[PDB]
Design a protein around this nucleic acid. Structure first.
Lengths: 123, 84, 56, 97, 137
RNA sequence: GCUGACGACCAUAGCACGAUGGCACCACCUGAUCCCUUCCCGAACUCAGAAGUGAAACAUCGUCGCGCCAAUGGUAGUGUGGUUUCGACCAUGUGAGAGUAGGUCAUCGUCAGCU
RNA sequence: CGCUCAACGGAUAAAAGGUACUCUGGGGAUAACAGGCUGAUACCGCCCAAGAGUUCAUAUCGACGGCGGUGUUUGGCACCUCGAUGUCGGCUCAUCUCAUCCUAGGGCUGAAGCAGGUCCUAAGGGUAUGGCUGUUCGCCAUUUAAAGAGGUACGCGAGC
RNA sequence: CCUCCUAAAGAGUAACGGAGGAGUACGAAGGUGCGCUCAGAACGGUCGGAAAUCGUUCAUAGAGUAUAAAGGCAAAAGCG
RNA sequence: CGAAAGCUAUUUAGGUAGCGCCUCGGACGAAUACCAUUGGGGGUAGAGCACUGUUUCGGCACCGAUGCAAACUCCGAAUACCGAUGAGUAAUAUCCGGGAGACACACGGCGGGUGCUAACGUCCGUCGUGGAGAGGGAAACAACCCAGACCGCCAGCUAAGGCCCCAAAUUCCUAGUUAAGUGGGAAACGAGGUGGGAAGGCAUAGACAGCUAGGAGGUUGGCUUAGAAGCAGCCAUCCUUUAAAGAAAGCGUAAUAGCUCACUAGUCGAGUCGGCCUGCGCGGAAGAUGUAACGG
């Protein structure tokens, strides 16, 4: 698996060597019985839109982003529990690390790539 | 708002009450013109002594006592006014 | 024939018709005892509040 | 095996509250009807009834109920159990002519 | 994951679960049943996990009957949404279980390997259960 | 004894199957001139009639195959008072539905006609 | 007879916005902080055991599912405070918990030794300095026996 | 504004509760007198079929009711 | 004497108005309430598949079994509501008028919607309490329980709750249970705690345990597999010598080997074995200023 993280979104790509097997969209049909948020997981948290509590003066951005990556990990683990195979975490170094201290099975992670480009719109 | 499941299915309409039902029950004294049943359709049918309005309202045609019955081959509910 | 009815429990916080059964029996306070004819209609009032009155 | 002992269930032992009290006294209410005469209300000891229900020909043979006196040849027609606990709650016997 | 093919209505009132299972408290099709002694909701996920664990233990030599079907949609509210603004969307399906109901029946197998499969299934269910025989009355 | 008309009642009255009925009555039935009918048709309606038949229908009788009716007992629920582990339970009053045993091939009234 | 006077008991025949330049009267009737209630979510634990582990469910890990505990994340509510309970981070100075990071004692091990892994007992002490960024964090460099997880108004601005 | 449910077997009864309609139409689709009975299914029949129209046999409404739903509808309120 | 925090409407929503509820005056006089008997209509609780849907299995859409439903009903209560008749009890009901206040309600029950059958959450219905209510109990505690304070008393009886000491009243009586300070937080699940109950199996033809001897031949059953030998998996599970011994219930091996077990005989001598049901216990059970989860 390739878990792609940004501060605004998460993607999940199933892969075999050089090729993408599936990208886990709504049309994947392996996300049907998902109890967590299915991919692509947009970060629609309260601080990103503005309803919330604890406006900017609280400086809760890190805690909110940590919980968002925790939910992303919940989705990844749910999809992995049926088709176990290792995961590669792709994203900014800060996002990778926030994910690492939140992942349910951090010993399943084989690699972390922090220099991949156009993580939101990329192929 | 994670899972975005706040789906608007907007239906908050309802009509005003119509206050249908049985107005006078069995064995009660009744005078002509008194409304006995308000209803939609003939949940109750008019027997002797009671008339039926354009609205299917049942009313006493003459004085007396209201009587409820099940009569006929359709086992219909009937309201009558007995002279008593 | 008559019977003796005594109030043993407060009627203060009971149902409206239970307070009215106490009033129709003639009972006004705790330990008040009244004489009332022993008919089915007064027996029904006793039965309505039988948890708070006793018949001697 | 096909014989059981009963006790007459009086009119003060009938109804919901008296039935619950009767089962608290380890008795099962039962009714014998059919045949020719009027229904008779009886009580069966629950341990005896459970032991009888263990046998499988009990449900297809002619049973004999001895109500402390009179005898009744019957057939078990219905059996009411507790939905969850499973113990027998009521028994229905039909006289054989 | 059982689910009705189509429903008259999407959403349901909560309701109440009261009373004993006077219907469905009998081993009807099989020879061996697992019945519930407590009440509650049986999720379709629970039904699927229990069915899988019975099927694996009986190994295609026996027949299983699932006596519970999840036909009640349960709505859920997502996180970070206030109270109100309309009933939440349906997230999963349950069956209403009363004390006494048979959930699973097994037939065509030994008593021992039926009891093992039923115990295995009970382990995955949100109910206190008991294993019952088929009587005739 | 039976037939017809009009009712009461509205399956314990119904359905199905079989049997009986033509002196009265009823029904088919004959003809379409006439009255009257048909978006065509004497099928239905209508008229004028008795050569024929109870075939159909109808009426009557029999039965339990279906339907319908239906206990007794038990269970569920429940008003009031109390208790509770919130499931329920106790006292008292009430009491199903389903199912079982069982029942049923209706019962009456006014008038006329043949016997 | 003439009203989508449809905000449909219809304010005028006739009507939009900005305010961080602001102002008044009020409200904890009502939000943002912190407390409280809750615990969905989160974290931690436990139950089952399909499996992985050369063999071998249970050394280690635990799919599908089930059950708790905590208050500890993201939330829900709007009970307290609007005749004012100063925000984040740092500094200083702390204090408690144990779900233990080191040190201490143990069982098991897929424990030869050395090193470990997991769990049990254990809170007495100890538990870095820098580069970057306001950061908390995080990444990184170099160490250390170790560089703990938390609560304390996310401890501490009438202490900075 | 109307219909159903929530609504706890009289009426009423809230929520940014769950679902649907209305802001018309008709001089006949109104009145009356007279007359009629639907949907389907099977069998037979030129084009002609899964299904056109014709014939037969079952068919208390499984139809219709200008229109949403509910209630009603054989004396039909349905159709001439 | 004594509310209301409701309905309707409102550029209304914390304002106001009509109605409801309070008071005062007048009229009227049982028209009122309670209960008994009695006349009604109902579609709820329950229930059920006859319709609308939905569900499973079998036979062959239909048949037969089998489930479920707010917007399904072939059915169907209790209550409640509307009437009648009749007692007794009672500071009634109704109408006309003067004066209001109130239209932020809260909790505990019960029936629900909503929420997570979460919330000291929210929205209705319905009862009680608070509001606007003191006293006693619940350690403390508007809303819980008992009970409605005119004033005075160094009199008596009781309610809820209590009676070893704080602290008034039993170190009361009878029968039993618990050993966990359980009582005096917490589940799935686990266990050979302990008491009781309804039944079973075996036993002086010697039961249960222990100990001694055996536990075998076809045969490595066939298939599979790299192997596959009682013991990965799949299909059989047959025969023989027997006193007995499984085509094996475990450990072990790469597969073998090996060690057991079931089972039989011997020794021993008297009760013993395993399920079910009920009561009370046990583990599961970790948090932050101080014991700190009986007020002591």
């Amino acid at each position: 698996y390739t878990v792609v993280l940004t501060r605004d979104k998460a993607r999940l790509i199933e892969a075999a060597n050089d090729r993408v097997v599936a990208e886990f969209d709504t049309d994947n049909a392996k996300q049907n019985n998902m109890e967590g948020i299915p991919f692509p997981i947009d970060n629609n948290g309260l601080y990103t839109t503005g309803d919330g509590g604890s406006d900017r003066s609280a400086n809760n951005e890190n805690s909110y982003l940590k919980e968002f990556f925790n939910q992303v990990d919940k989705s990844v683990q749910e999809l992995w529990g049926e088709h176990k195979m290792p995961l590669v975490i792709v994203g900014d170094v800060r996002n990778i690390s926030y994910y690492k201290e939140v992942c349910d099975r951090p010993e399943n992670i084989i690699a972390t790539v922090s220099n991949l480009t156009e993580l939101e719109d990329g192929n | 708002a994670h899972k975005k499941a706040a789906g608007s299915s907007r239906n908050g309409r309802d009509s005003n009450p119509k206050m249908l039902g049985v107005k006078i029950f069995g064995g009660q004294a009744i005078v002509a013109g008194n409304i006995i049943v308000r209803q939609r359709g003939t949940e109750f049918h008019a027997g002797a002594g009671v008339g039926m309005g354009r609205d299917h309202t049942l009313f006493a045609l003459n004085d007396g006592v209201v009587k409820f019955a099940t009569k006929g081959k359709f086992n219909r509910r009937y309201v009558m006014v007995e002279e008593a | 024939k008559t019977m003796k009815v005594t109030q043993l429990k407060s009627g203060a916080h009971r149902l409206k018709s239970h307070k009215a059964s106490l009033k129709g029996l003639g009972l006004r306070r705790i330990n008040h005892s009244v004489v009332v004819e022993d008919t089915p209609s007064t027996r029904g009032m006793v039965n309505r509040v039988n948890y708070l009155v006793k018949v001697e | 095996h096909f014989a059981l002992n009963a006790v007459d269930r009086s009119a003060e032992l009938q109804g919901k509250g008296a039935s619950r009290r009767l089962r608290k006294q380890n008795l099962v209410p039962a009714i014998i009807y059919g045949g020719n005469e009027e229904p008779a209300s009886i009580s069966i000891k629950i341990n005896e009834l459970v032991k009888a229900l263990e046998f499988e020909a009990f449900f297809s043979h002619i049973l004999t109920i001895t109500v402390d006196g009179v005898e009744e040849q019957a057939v078990i027609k219905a059996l009411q159990r507790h939905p969850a606990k499973g113990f027998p709650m009521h028994a229905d016997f039909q006289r054989i002519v | 994951m059982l689910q009705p093919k189509r429903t008259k209505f999407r959403k349901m009132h909560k309701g109440r679960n009261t009373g004993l299972a006077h219907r469905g408290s009998t081993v009807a099709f099989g020879q061996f049943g697992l019945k519930s002694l407590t009440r509650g909701r049986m999720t379709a996920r629970q039904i699927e996990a229990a069915r899988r664990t019975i099927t694996r233990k009986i190994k295609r030599g026996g027949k299983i009957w699932i006596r519970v079907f999840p036909d009640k949609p349960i709505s859920n509210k997502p996180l970070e949404v206030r109270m109100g603004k309309g009933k939440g969307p349906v997230e999963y399906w349950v069956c209403e279980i009363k004390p006494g109901k048979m959930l699973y029946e097994l037939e065509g197998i030994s008593e021992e390997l039926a009891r093992e499969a039923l115990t295995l299934a009970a382990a995955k269910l949100p109910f206190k259960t008991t294993i019952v025989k088929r009587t005739i009355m």
